[PDB]
């Protein structure tokens, strides 16, 4: 039996999954861990490992990697969970190992990677407080070229009246995400900060596991893949549509919570933003 986490329905992902909109064809990146492609509920297109010691991107040593995938785009079966957008054609981009970090130079060498081979959407669930010449240079690339660029807000919270929006979310070309609970609530790790773009779920996230396992983390890494997902859907919608016009849409028709500072225009409405 096949569960449907909460937070691809709170986003309202389903109702184009029955109109026969689940993101065929649009190539997504995920940036992360790696995605085990041996996982009965994924379907893992291709990829590359920019990890020196770790050189099989299909293979997840940390797990994080897999669960962000899982969000995106876990399989329409009759098993585990349901993504996003479980038609997407899902790529693996290793730039983190197995203890969960990664250097700058991997993560920038994955984005250019990502943009040499035609990617749609890219999902980096991944940030630091830093930001370099290098890395703002990628992202804006990637943007130029066409690709929708989602990344996580952070999990710093608030402190005091300053942002405390990671890199590369704090690059206006670059779509920040925070997390809400199912109640709608900001999480109280959730970066806060005038880049805020959209909130998703990220609170008790449901999701695959290598191994052929499932459990739930909460995090703005979990929050991230659902916008990803939600770029997928409006393009598999509208094919034509260039990545400002995807992120005006996606901006544009959200369900307004408190404050931008807080909620940036607030939780995504896909079923809106598809049009
Ligand atoms: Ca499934
Ligand atoms: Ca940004």
């Known amino acids: 039996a096949q569960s449907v986490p909460y937070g691809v329905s709170q986003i309202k992902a389903p109702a184009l999954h029955s109109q026969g909109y689940t993101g065929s064809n649009v190539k997504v990146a995920v940036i992360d861990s790696g995605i085990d492609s041996s996982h009965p509920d994924l379907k893992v297109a291709g990829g590359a490992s920019f990890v020196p010691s770790e050189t099989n991107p299909f293979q997840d040593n940390n797990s994080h990697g897999t669960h962000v995938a899982g969000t995106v785009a876990a399989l329409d079966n009759s098993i585990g969970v349901l993504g996003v957008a479980p038609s997407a054609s899902l790529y693996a981009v290793k730039?983190?190992?197995?203890?969960?970090?990664?250097?700058?130079?991997?993560?920038?060498?994955?984005?250019?990677?990502?943009?040499?081979?035609?990617?749609?959407?890219?999902?980096?669930?991944?940030?630091?407080?830093?930001?370099?010449?290098?890395?703002?240079?990628?992202?804006?690339?990637?943007?130029?070229?066409?690709?929708?660029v989602v990344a996580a807000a952070g999990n710093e919270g608030?402190?005091?009246?300053?942002?405390?929006?990671?890199?590369?979310?704090?690059?206006?070309?670059?779509?920040?995400?925070?997390?809400?609970?199912?109640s709608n609530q900001r999480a109280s790790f959730s970066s806060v900060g005038p880049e805020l773009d959209v909130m998703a779920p990220g609170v008790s996230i449901c999701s695959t596991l290598p191994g052929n396992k499932y459990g739930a983390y909460s995090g703005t890494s979990m929050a991230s893949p659902h916008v990803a997902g939600a770029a997928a859907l409006i393009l598999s919608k509208h094919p034509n549509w260039t990545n400002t016009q995807v992120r005006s849409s996606l901006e544009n028709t959200t369900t307004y919570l408190g404050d931008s500072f807080y909620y940036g225009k607030g939780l995504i409405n896909v079923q809106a933003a598809a049009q």
């Open 95 to 148: 730039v983190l190992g197995a203890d969960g970090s990664g250097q700058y130079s991997w993560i920038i060498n994955g984005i250019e990677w990502a943009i040499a081979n035609n990617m749609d959407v890219i999902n980096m669930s991944l940030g630091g407080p830093s930001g370099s010449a290098a890395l703002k240079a990628a992202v804006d690339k990637a943007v130029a070229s066409g690709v929708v």
């Open 158 to 182: 608030t402190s005091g009246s300053s942002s405390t929006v990671g890199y590369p979310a704090k690059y206006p070309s670059v779509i920040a995400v925070g997390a809400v609970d199912s």
